[model samples]
Target: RADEQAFLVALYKYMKERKTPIERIPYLGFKQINLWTMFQAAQKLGGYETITARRQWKHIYDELGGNPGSTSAATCTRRHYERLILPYERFIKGEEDKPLPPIKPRK
Candidate 1:
């Protein structure tokens, strides 16, 4: 009973903060299965193993979006931009047919 109360309190707080519909909360149980548990299971589906991987994928999140000149939290530094392009400089300059180095692996 104590555990159930604790879970309900947390769920109520989460719903309140997110402005979830109250009527949607009661039907949480359906077809003899807990929809809450199913919802959690649904969230786990994805390709990237980590957030960094997802960020690096151009299709997912473009890492090169923000202006480099800006000093805000979203700004990408010139040094970082240089590092990404430096390896391809040789290719760009027609120096050689050598392949560029692989992108930096996620830590």
Candidate 2:
């Protein structure tokens, strides 16, 4: 899994270096709060003919946290809530053309 980790690290670094704003990240809402669980979900979703699933790796990385140079894995994982995962769930489930709510300021 180190390859995955390396990719994830670089991905986070790229987002952080770019200073991506929260609004740019897609919003992912699910009952699972754990990133690992989300990773599993992404992995499972990846098996099918889905655009989002095929890119679940990016989703997992985004979900874990969009910034690199975190002090520790614990810190990164703790910060998972900071990044948005995916917003297509609702839209895919028949919320077509539904407007997204206003983006709130991060606490």
Candidate 3:
């Protein structure tokens, strides 16, 4: 089974470290059975158009031996955008610094 939470949490941390805002990460890179969402699978595996972006994901996923069946990988990529990217964009656009609260795990 894939450790989706740990993987995404680590991704979150890494994005934080890079000051990446989590939104622009979609254009960054990744690979899996799905790309955008379970409903929005990549037409091709690792559908990144930029050589840099594709190579980035290729190296990381190759190192990690990414799971081919877990949509969570793709979901995390999108979540990065939704959670960090857009909010930060709003902040830049003078929206405000709304806190990013952590997700609560159900008991």
**If scored against the real structure, what TM-score would every candidate get?**
0.23, 0.29, 0.25
Evaluate all candidate structures by whole-model CA lDDT and list the values in order: 0.32, 0.42, 0.40
| lDDT ranking, high to low | 2, 3, 1
TM-score of 3: 0.25
**Which residue ranges in model 2 land beyond 4 Å of their true spot?**
21-37, 47-107
User: Which of candidates 1 and 2 is the stronger one according to TM-score?
Assistant: 2
TM-score (C-alpha, index-matched) for candidate 2: 0.29
Better of 2 and 3 by lDDT: 2
1-107, model 2: which lDDT tens digit per residue?
56445544555566566675433443333323343355444545451135233534444545445446533332333235335233222333344333553363442
Please give the lDDT score at residue 39 for candidate 2: 47
Runs off by more than 4 Å, candidate 3:
23-40, 43-107
The window of 10 residues in a row where model 2 has the poorest summed lDDT is 84-93
Ranking by TM-score: 2, 3, 1
For residue 78, what is the lDDT in candidate 1?
22
Best by lDDT: 2
Q: Which 10 consecutive positions of candidate 1 have the poorest summed lDDT?
A: 73-82
